[PDB]
Coordinates of C-alpha atoms and ligand atoms in Angstrom, one line a residue:
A1 CA 100.7 130.8 72.2
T2 CA 100.5 133.4 75.0
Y3 CA 98.6 132.4 78.2
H4 CA 98.0 133.8 81.6
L5 CA 97.9 132.3 85.1
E6 CA 94.7 130.6 86.1
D7 CA 95.7 128.4 89.0
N8 CA 98.8 128.2 91.2
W9 CA 99.0 125.1 93.4
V10 CA 101.7 124.9 96.1
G11 CA 101.8 122.8 99.4
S12 CA 98.6 123.0 101.4
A13 CA 96.6 124.6 98.5
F14 CA 96.2 121.0 97.0
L15 CA 94.0 120.1 100.0
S16 CA 91.3 122.5 99.0
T17 CA 91.6 122.5 95.2
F18 CA 91.9 118.7 94.6
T19 CA 90.0 115.8 96.1
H20 CA 91.2 112.3 96.9
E21 CA 89.3 109.6 95.0
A22 CA 88.8 106.6 97.3
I23 CA 87.7 104.5 94.4
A24 CA 88.1 100.9 93.1
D25 CA 91.2 101.1 90.8
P26 CA 89.8 101.4 87.3
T27 CA 93.0 99.7 86.1
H28 CA 92.6 96.8 88.5
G29 CA 95.9 97.3 90.5
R30 CA 97.0 95.9 93.8
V31 CA 96.1 99.2 95.5
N32 CA 93.8 100.6 98.1
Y33 CA 93.0 104.2 97.2
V34 CA 92.1 106.0 100.5
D35 CA 90.1 109.2 101.0
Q36 CA 91.7 112.5 102.0
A37 CA 91.0 112.2 105.7
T38 CA 92.6 108.8 105.8
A39 CA 95.5 109.9 103.5
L40 CA 96.4 112.8 105.9
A41 CA 96.1 110.8 109.2
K42 CA 98.3 108.0 107.8
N43 CA 100.7 110.5 106.1
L44 CA 100.2 109.1 102.6
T45 CA 99.5 112.7 101.7
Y46 CA 101.6 115.5 103.2
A47 CA 100.9 119.1 102.0
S48 CA 102.8 121.9 103.7
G49 CA 105.1 124.8 102.9
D50 CA 106.4 124.4 99.2
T51 CA 105.9 120.6 99.2
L52 CA 103.2 118.1 98.2
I53 CA 104.1 114.5 99.0
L54 CA 101.9 111.7 97.6
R55 CA 103.1 108.2 98.6
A56 CA 102.3 104.5 99.1
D57 CA 102.3 102.6 102.3
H58 CA 105.9 101.4 102.9
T59 CA 105.4 99.6 106.3
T60 CA 102.4 97.2 106.0
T61 CA 102.8 93.6 104.8
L62 CA 99.5 93.0 103.0
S63 CA 97.0 90.3 103.8
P64 CA 96.9 88.3 100.5
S65 CA 93.1 88.1 100.9
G66 CA 92.7 91.8 102.0
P67 CA 92.8 95.1 100.1
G68 CA 95.8 96.3 98.0
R69 CA 98.7 98.6 99.1
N70 CA 97.4 102.0 100.5
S71 CA 98.0 104.8 98.0
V72 CA 96.4 108.0 96.7
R73 CA 94.8 109.4 93.6
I74 CA 94.1 113.1 93.6
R75 CA 91.9 114.9 91.1
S76 CA 91.5 118.7 90.5
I77 CA 88.1 120.1 91.3
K78 CA 88.3 122.4 88.2
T79 CA 88.3 121.2 84.5
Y80 CA 90.2 122.7 81.6
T81 CA 89.9 122.7 77.8
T82 CA 92.4 125.0 76.1
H83 CA 95.2 125.5 78.6
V84 CA 98.8 124.9 79.6
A85 CA 99.6 122.8 82.7
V86 CA 103.1 123.0 84.3
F87 CA 104.3 120.4 86.8
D88 CA 107.5 121.1 88.8
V89 CA 108.3 117.6 90.1
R90 CA 111.2 116.8 92.4
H91 CA 110.6 113.1 92.8
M92 CA 108.2 110.5 91.3
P93 CA 107.3 107.0 92.6
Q94 CA 109.9 104.3 92.0
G95 CA 109.8 100.5 92.8
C96 CA 109.0 97.2 91.1
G97 CA 105.3 97.1 90.6
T98 CA 104.8 100.9 90.7
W99 CA 102.6 102.6 88.1
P100 CA 102.5 106.4 88.7
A101 CA 100.8 109.0 86.5
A102 CA 100.2 112.7 86.1
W103 CA 97.4 113.0 83.5
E104 CA 94.2 114.6 82.4
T105 CA 90.8 113.0 81.7
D106 CA 87.0 113.3 82.1
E107 CA 86.2 110.2 84.1
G108 CA 82.5 110.6 83.6
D109 CA 82.5 109.7 79.9
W110 CA 85.9 107.9 79.4
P111 CA 87.2 107.4 76.7
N112 CA 85.0 109.9 74.8
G113 CA 86.2 113.0 76.7
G114 CA 89.7 111.8 76.0
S115 CA 92.7 111.2 78.3
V116 CA 96.3 112.6 78.0
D117 CA 99.2 111.2 80.0
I118 CA 102.0 113.7 80.7
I119 CA 104.0 111.5 83.1
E120 CA 103.5 107.7 83.1
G121 CA 105.4 104.4 83.2
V122 CA 105.6 101.1 85.0
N123 CA 108.2 99.1 87.0
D124 CA 110.9 101.8 86.9
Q125 CA 111.2 101.4 83.1
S126 CA 112.5 104.7 81.5
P127 CA 111.9 106.6 79.5
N128 CA 108.6 108.5 80.1
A129 CA 105.6 107.8 77.9
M130 CA 103.2 110.6 76.8
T131 CA 99.9 109.0 75.5
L132 CA 96.4 110.0 74.3
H133 CA 93.5 107.6 74.6
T134 CA 90.4 108.5 72.6
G135 CA 87.2 107.0 70.9
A136 CA 87.1 106.2 67.1
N137 CA 88.8 108.2 64.3
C138 CA 91.9 109.6 66.0
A139 CA 95.3 108.7 64.8
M140 CA 98.8 110.4 64.5
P141 CA 101.0 110.9 61.4
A142 CA 104.0 108.6 61.3
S143 CA 106.4 111.6 61.4
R144 CA 105.9 114.9 63.0
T145 CA 108.1 117.5 64.7
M146 CA 109.1 116.4 68.3
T147 CA 112.2 115.3 70.1
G148 CA 110.5 112.1 71.3
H149 CA 109.8 108.8 69.5
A150 CA 106.3 107.6 68.6
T151 CA 105.4 104.0 69.3
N152 CA 101.6 103.4 68.7
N153 CA 99.9 105.9 66.4
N154 CA 96.3 104.9 66.7
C155 CA 94.7 106.7 69.8
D156 CA 91.4 104.9 69.6
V157 CA 91.1 102.6 72.6
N158 CA 88.7 100.2 70.8
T159 CA 91.1 99.4 67.9
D160 CA 94.5 99.8 69.6
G161 CA 94.4 97.2 72.4
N162 CA 94.1 100.1 74.8
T163 CA 97.7 101.2 74.2
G164 CA 96.6 104.7 73.0
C165 CA 98.8 106.7 70.7
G166 CA 102.1 107.3 72.5
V167 CA 105.5 109.0 72.4
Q168 CA 108.6 107.9 74.3
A169 CA 110.8 110.8 75.8
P170 CA 114.3 110.8 74.4
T171 CA 116.3 110.7 77.7
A172 CA 116.3 108.2 80.6
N173 CA 116.1 111.1 83.2
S174 CA 112.6 111.7 81.9
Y175 CA 111.4 108.9 84.2
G176 CA 112.0 106.6 87.2
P177 CA 115.2 106.1 89.3
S178 CA 117.0 108.2 86.7
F179 CA 114.6 111.1 87.0
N180 CA 114.8 110.8 90.7
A181 CA 118.7 110.7 90.8
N182 CA 118.7 114.0 88.8
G183 CA 116.2 115.8 91.1
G184 CA 113.3 115.6 88.7
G185 CA 112.5 118.4 86.3
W186 CA 109.6 120.1 84.7
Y187 CA 106.7 118.8 82.6
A188 CA 104.5 121.2 80.6
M189 CA 101.5 120.3 78.5
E190 CA 99.8 122.7 76.1
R191 CA 96.3 121.7 74.8
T192 CA 94.5 123.6 72.1
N193 CA 91.7 122.6 69.6
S194 CA 94.6 121.9 67.1
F195 CA 97.1 119.8 69.0
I196 CA 98.5 118.6 72.3
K197 CA 102.2 119.1 73.1
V198 CA 104.3 118.0 76.0
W199 CA 107.7 119.4 77.0
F200 CA 110.1 117.8 79.4
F201 CA 113.0 119.8 81.0
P202 CA 115.4 117.9 83.3
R203 CA 116.2 119.6 86.7
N204 CA 119.7 120.4 85.6
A205 CA 118.8 121.7 82.0
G206 CA 120.7 124.8 80.9
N207 CA 117.9 125.6 78.5
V208 CA 114.7 125.5 80.7
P209 CA 112.4 128.4 79.7
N210 CA 112.1 130.9 82.6
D211 CA 108.4 130.6 81.8
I212 CA 108.5 127.1 83.1
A213 CA 111.2 127.3 85.8
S214 CA 110.0 130.5 87.6
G215 CA 106.2 130.4 87.1
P216 CA 105.4 134.0 86.3
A217 CA 101.8 135.1 85.4
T218 CA 102.4 135.3 81.6
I219 CA 103.9 132.5 79.5
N220 CA 104.5 132.1 75.8
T221 CA 105.0 128.6 74.4
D222 CA 106.4 129.9 71.1
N223 CA 109.7 130.4 73.0
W224 CA 109.8 126.8 74.4
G225 CA 111.6 125.0 71.6
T226 CA 110.5 121.7 70.0
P227 CA 108.0 119.7 72.1
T228 CA 109.0 116.3 73.5
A229 CA 105.7 114.8 72.3
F230 CA 103.5 116.3 69.5
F231 CA 99.9 115.2 68.8
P232 CA 98.9 117.2 65.8
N233 CA 95.4 117.2 64.2
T234 CA 96.5 115.9 60.8
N235 CA 94.5 112.6 61.4
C236 CA 92.6 113.5 64.5
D237 CA 90.2 116.3 65.3
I238 CA 91.7 117.1 68.7
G239 CA 89.0 119.3 70.1
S240 CA 86.2 116.9 69.2
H241 CA 87.9 114.0 71.1
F242 CA 88.7 115.8 74.3
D243 CA 86.3 117.7 76.5
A244 CA 86.8 119.6 79.8
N245 CA 89.3 117.5 81.8
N246 CA 90.4 117.4 85.4
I247 CA 94.1 116.9 86.3
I248 CA 94.8 113.6 88.1
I249 CA 98.0 112.5 89.9
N250 CA 98.1 109.0 91.3
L251 CA 100.1 105.9 92.1
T252 CA 98.8 102.4 91.5
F253 CA 100.5 99.0 91.6
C254 CA 100.4 96.0 89.2
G255 CA 97.0 95.8 87.4
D256 CA 96.2 95.9 83.7
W257 CA 99.6 97.2 82.5
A258 CA 102.3 97.0 85.2
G259 CA 101.0 93.6 86.5
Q260 CA 101.4 91.6 83.3
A261 CA 104.1 89.0 83.9
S262 CA 106.0 89.7 80.7
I263 CA 106.1 93.4 81.5
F264 CA 106.8 93.0 85.3
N265 CA 109.5 90.3 84.6
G266 CA 110.7 92.0 81.4
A267 CA 111.6 94.9 83.7
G268 CA 113.9 92.8 85.9
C269 CA 111.4 92.5 88.7
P270 CA 111.2 89.0 90.4
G271 CA 108.2 86.8 90.9
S272 CA 104.7 88.0 90.5
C273 CA 103.7 91.6 90.8
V274 CA 101.0 91.0 93.5
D275 CA 103.2 88.9 95.7
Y276 CA 106.0 91.4 95.4
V277 CA 103.7 94.3 96.4
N278 CA 102.2 92.3 99.2
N279 CA 105.4 91.3 100.9
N280 CA 108.1 94.0 100.3
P281 CA 106.8 97.2 102.0
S282 CA 110.3 98.8 102.5
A283 CA 110.9 98.4 98.8
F284 CA 108.3 101.3 98.4
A285 CA 110.0 103.8 100.8
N286 CA 110.8 105.7 97.5
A287 CA 107.3 105.2 96.0
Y288 CA 106.5 108.9 96.5
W289 CA 105.7 112.0 94.4
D290 CA 107.4 115.2 95.6
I291 CA 105.7 118.0 93.8
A292 CA 106.9 121.7 94.2
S293 CA 104.0 123.3 92.2
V294 CA 101.4 122.7 89.6
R295 CA 100.3 125.8 87.6
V296 CA 97.5 126.2 85.0
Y297 CA 97.5 129.0 82.5
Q298 CA 94.6 129.9 80.2
Ligands
LIG301 C1 105.0 112.8 107.0 O1 105.7 112.9 105.8 C2 106.5 114.0 105.7 C3 107.0 114.2 104.3 O2 107.8 113.1 104.0 C4 107.6 114.1 106.8 O3 108.3 115.3 106.7 C5 109.7 115.1 106.8 O4 110.2 115.0 108.1 C6 111.6 114.7 108.3 C7 111.9 114.4 109.8 O5 111.2 115.4 110.6 C8 112.4 115.9 107.7 O6 113.7 115.4 107.6 C9 114.7 116.4 108.1 O7 115.0 117.4 107.2 C10 115.8 118.4 107.7 C11 116.0 119.5 106.6 O8 114.7 119.9 106.2 C12 114.7 121.1 105.3 O9 115.4 120.9 104.1 C13 114.8 119.9 103.3 C14 115.7 119.8 102.0 O10 115.6 121.2 101.5 C15 116.4 121.3 100.3 O11 116.0 120.6 99.2 C16 114.8 121.0 98.6 C17 114.5 120.2 97.3 O12 114.0 118.9 97.6 C18 114.6 122.5 98.4 O13 113.3 122.8 98.1 C19 115.2 123.3 99.5 O14 115.4 124.7 99.1 C20 116.5 122.8 100.0 O15 117.5 122.9 99.0 C21 118.8 123.2 99.6 O16 119.7 122.2 99.5 C22 120.0 121.8 98.1 C23 120.9 120.6 98.1 O17 120.4 119.5 98.9 C24 120.5 123.0 97.3 O18 120.6 122.7 95.9 C25 119.6 124.2 97.5 O19 120.1 125.4 96.9 C26 119.3 124.5 99.0 O20 120.5 124.8 99.7 C27 113.4 120.2 102.9 O21 112.7 119.1 102.3 C28 112.5 120.7 104.1 O22 111.4 121.4 103.6 C29 110.2 121.1 104.4 O23 110.1 122.0 105.5 C30 109.9 123.4 105.0 C31 109.7 124.3 106.3 O24 110.8 124.1 107.1 C32 108.7 123.6 104.1 O25 108.7 124.9 103.5 C33 108.7 122.5 102.9 O26 107.5 122.5 102.2 C34 109.0 121.1 103.5 O27 107.9 120.7 104.2 C35 113.3 121.6 105.0 O28 113.5 122.9 104.4 C36 117.1 117.9 108.2 O29 117.8 118.9 109.0 C37 116.9 116.7 109.1 O30 118.2 116.0 109.5 C38 116.0 115.6 108.5 O31 116.6 115.0 107.4 C39 111.9 116.4 106.3 O32 112.3 117.7 106.2 C40 110.4 116.3 106.1 N1 110.1 116.4 104.7 C41 109.3 117.3 104.2 C42 108.7 118.2 105.2 O33 109.1 117.4 103.0 C43 107.0 113.9 108.2 O34 108.0 113.6 109.1 C44 106.0 112.7 108.2 N2 105.3 112.7 109.5 C45 105.4 111.7 110.4 C46 106.1 110.4 110.0 O35 104.9 111.8 111.5
LIG302 O1 100.6 102.1 76.2 C1 100.5 103.0 77.3 C2 99.1 102.7 77.9 O2 99.0 101.4 78.4 C3 97.7 101.0 78.9 O3 97.7 99.6 79.3 C4 97.4 98.7 78.3 C5 96.6 97.6 79.0 O4 95.3 98.0 79.3 C6 96.4 96.3 78.1 O5 95.9 95.3 78.9 C7 94.7 94.7 78.4 C8 93.7 94.8 79.6 O6 93.5 96.2 79.8 C9 92.5 94.0 79.3 O7 91.6 94.1 80.5 C10 90.4 94.7 80.2 C11 90.3 96.0 81.1 O8 91.1 97.0 80.6 C12 88.8 96.5 81.1 O9 88.6 97.6 82.0 C13 88.4 98.8 81.3 C14 88.9 99.9 82.2 O10 90.3 99.9 82.3 C15 88.5 101.3 81.7 O11 88.7 102.2 82.8 C16 89.4 103.4 82.4 C17 90.9 103.2 82.5 O12 91.5 102.3 81.6 C18 91.7 104.5 82.5 O13 93.0 104.2 82.8 C19 93.9 105.3 82.6 C20 94.5 105.3 81.2 O14 93.6 105.8 80.2 C21 95.9 106.0 81.2 O15 96.0 106.7 80.0 O16 96.3 106.8 82.3 C22 95.8 106.5 83.7 C23 97.0 106.6 84.7 O17 98.0 105.6 84.4 C24 95.0 105.2 83.7 O18 94.4 105.2 85.0 O19 91.1 105.5 83.4 C25 89.7 105.8 83.0 C26 89.3 107.0 83.9 O20 89.3 106.8 85.3 C27 88.8 104.5 83.2 O21 87.5 104.8 82.8 O22 87.1 101.4 81.4 C28 86.7 100.5 80.4 C29 85.2 100.8 80.1 O23 85.1 102.1 79.5 C30 86.9 99.1 80.8 O24 86.6 98.2 79.7 O25 88.0 95.4 81.5 C31 87.9 94.4 80.5 C32 86.8 93.5 81.0 O26 85.6 93.9 80.4 C33 89.2 93.7 80.3 O27 89.2 92.9 79.1 O28 92.8 92.6 79.1 C34 93.7 92.4 78.0 C35 94.0 90.9 78.0 O29 94.4 90.4 79.3 C36 95.0 93.2 78.2 O30 95.9 93.0 77.1 O31 97.7 95.9 77.5 C37 98.5 96.9 76.9 C38 99.9 96.2 76.8 O32 99.9 95.6 75.5 C39 98.7 98.2 77.7 O33 99.3 99.2 76.9 C40 97.4 101.8 80.1 O34 96.1 101.5 80.5 C41 97.5 103.3 79.8 O35 97.4 104.0 81.0 C42 98.8 103.7 79.1 O36 98.7 105.0 78.7

């Protein structure tokens, strides 16, 4: 469980080690994903000093017949198999309609190269969800050692209604306005051939491993306590369902999950998701990631 520093991304480093994907939203959201040149001119991406900002447009009222709300989706140039990824996150997007994620995938053969969500939710609904999506023959035992709570235990996208196999973080400050109020915190994900684990440490935690908080060149996950989410290989050959994955950090709106009326409305958001996102730009002034660092160890 000992790893050594492979990549250390801070501020402007993200501009040369990740790309912006100006792509049609694969989850069909009310979003216009812009390229890196456009992101920078329009200040949707700001990457300077010890800060990366990734945000949505919070000034434009959308044309109902035009493209969605301007936002960004960044993807690491490098891919990883057995590794630990540590995200020091000060702020994540909030707002009705928002659907932010920090995750890993191989887009080129989805779902067969797998996907793991480290940070994800919709419509400001805490807590955080940590979820795997795979092809066939991957499930999770009903009970295993973690602080979080499992919801769906079948990871196979074709037989699970695309929910994946997920775990809910135990605290509200894992996600959303609550996370943001607390100054964020740290997410760490360890992936091996045998398992995937995610740990969350709130910004104010008295027990955050120095490994995680200070980012030295050597880490040891044995010292990190029980994971928030645990995906063992009891009923899933982990290595055979995941290949080399890029890291992706993005913000979409509405679409296949967040945009469902029951979900959007069930979260206390008014009206329809698309109309809300069209007509309330100032409601997304806080729809930003503020990232202090992402580090990868191998
Ligand atoms: C495009 O978009 C960008 C990004 O949004 C816009 O940039 C912002 O521009 C505005 C207006 O010019 C700036 O607002 C001003 O900020 C002034 C103070 O700035 C300084 O402090 C900021 C806060 O720092 C503290 O908090 C952070 C955690 O979030 C810590 O890292 C840091 O150590 C500080 O902690 C102290 O305080 C806390 C308690 O609050 C304690 O607990 C700690 O112990 C510390 O005592 C900080 O965000 C700024 O950092 C920026 O600049 C430095 C270099 O100077 C760089 O290294 C960083 O990477 C970062 O870029 C800075 O240190 C304030 O005086 C003034 O009144 C006003 O509010 C704002 O700083 C910008 N935000 C940035 C840069 O992130 C940009 O304007 C926009 N372009 C457009 C529209 O054209
Ligand atoms: O539980 C947490 C979990 O929730 C998931 O949302 C679920 C909803 O998807 C589900 O709604 C059903 C509709 O999806 C369905 O509409 C069909 C379309 O989905 C389909 O398009 C497919 C594409 O979406 C797919 O593209 C891939 C993306 O899905 C993938 O998305 C990422 C996720 O994998 C995730 O983990 O993280 C990130 C960040 O948040 C997501 O971006 O990304 C990859 C790589 O880029 C894409 O390839 O590609 C396939 C082809 O391979 C397409 O089929 O299109 C068909 C038309 O043919 C539609 O039928 O309709 C149903 C009925 O209306 C609807 O129920 O609902 C449940 C709620 O019960 C949600 O749980 C999130 O997607 C997931 O992110 C999250 O972890």
